[PDB]
């Protein structure tokens, strides 16, 4: 029926790998700038080599995993769309920073998408934005966005840029 940005909904919970455990996943901003009350927009390097800034999305720090969970029961979600990448605001000091093992989209406990298959070496600061367009099973109740930091969480500014559902209904 219409597109509904995930950042325009409330999550059930949203964990992240940051050292400051009272920081929170950010709506429409990358994680660290967002928590620092900066206006900085989410931005990624695209396949065509340009940097795109996004109006909407989610910013987290990858964890073991970081898990952002939505109740989509009754909402008639048929599609999930997002770009995935490390936000340009991350500081890629060296190979140890901004290195994410994988990102998964999970629906009612089942992984329906993982970067691991096309991205066997994970994501890093140089990885171009990953375009994800997914069919969502009918009558689904829970959708989770999981990002896996691997060895360390340093610089793992994971953003789900322009993350939105196609949905028929009202959300809980
Ligand atoms: Ca990492």
Angstrom resolution of this structure: 1.5
Q: Which CATH number applies to 1-172?
A: 2.60.120.1060
d(CA 74, CA 172): 8
Can you tell me the distance from the alpha carbon of 132 to that of 97, in angstroms, rounded to the nearest whole number? Answer: 24
Whether residue 156 is annotated as binding a ligand: the answer is: yes
Distance 25 CA to ligand 1 centre (A): 17
CA dihedral 70, 4, 114, 17 (to 10 degrees): -50
149 annotated to bind ligand: yes
147 CA distance to ligand 1 middle (Å): 10
**How many angstroms separate the alpha carbon of residue 15 from the centre of ligand 1?**
15
* Method of structure determination: X-ray
How far, in Å, from the CA of 35 to the mean position of ligand 1? Answer: 19
Q: What would the two tokens of residue 101 be? A: 């093992």
**123 alpha carbon to ligand 1 midpoint, in Å?**
9
**Phi-psi label, residue 124: left if phi above 0, alpha if psi -120 to 50, beta otherwise:** beta
CA of 116 to the centre of ligand 1 (A): 15
Give the residue extent of every domain in the chain.
1-172
Q: Round to whole Å and give the CA distance between 74 and 7.
A: 19
CA 72 / ligand 1 centre spacing (Å): 29
Question: What's the CA-to-centroid distance between 146 and ligand 1, angstroms?
Answer: 13
DSSP symbols for 124-137: ETTPPPEEEEEE--
Burial 142-155 (b: 16+ CB within 10 A, else e): ebbbbbbbeeebbb
Cα–Cα distance for residue pair 26/40, rounded to 1 Å: 11
């Amino acid at each position: 029926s219409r597109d509904v940005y995930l950042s325009d909904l409330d999550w059930l919970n949203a964990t992240h790998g940051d050292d400051t455990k009272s920081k929170i996943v950010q709506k429409n901003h990358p994680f660290t700038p967002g928590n620092n009350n900066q206006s900085t927009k989410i931005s990624l390097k695209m396949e065509d080599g340009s940097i795109s800034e996004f109006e909407k999305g989610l910013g987290t720090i990858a964890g073991s995993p970081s898990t952002i969970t939505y109740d989509i029961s009754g909402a008639g979600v048929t599609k999930f769309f997002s770009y995935l990448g490390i936000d340009r605001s991350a500081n890629p000091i060296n190979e140890q920073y901004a290195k994410v093992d994988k990102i998964e989209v999970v629906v009612d406990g089942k992984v329906i998408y993982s970067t691991i298959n096309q991205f066997p070496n994970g994501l890093t600061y140089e990885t171009p934005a990953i375009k994800v367009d997914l069919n969502i099973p009918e009558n689904a109740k829970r959708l989770q966005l999981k990002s896996y930091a691997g060895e360390k969480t340093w610089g793992d500014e994971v953003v789900y840029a322009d993350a939105k559902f196609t949905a028929k209904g009202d959300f809980v």
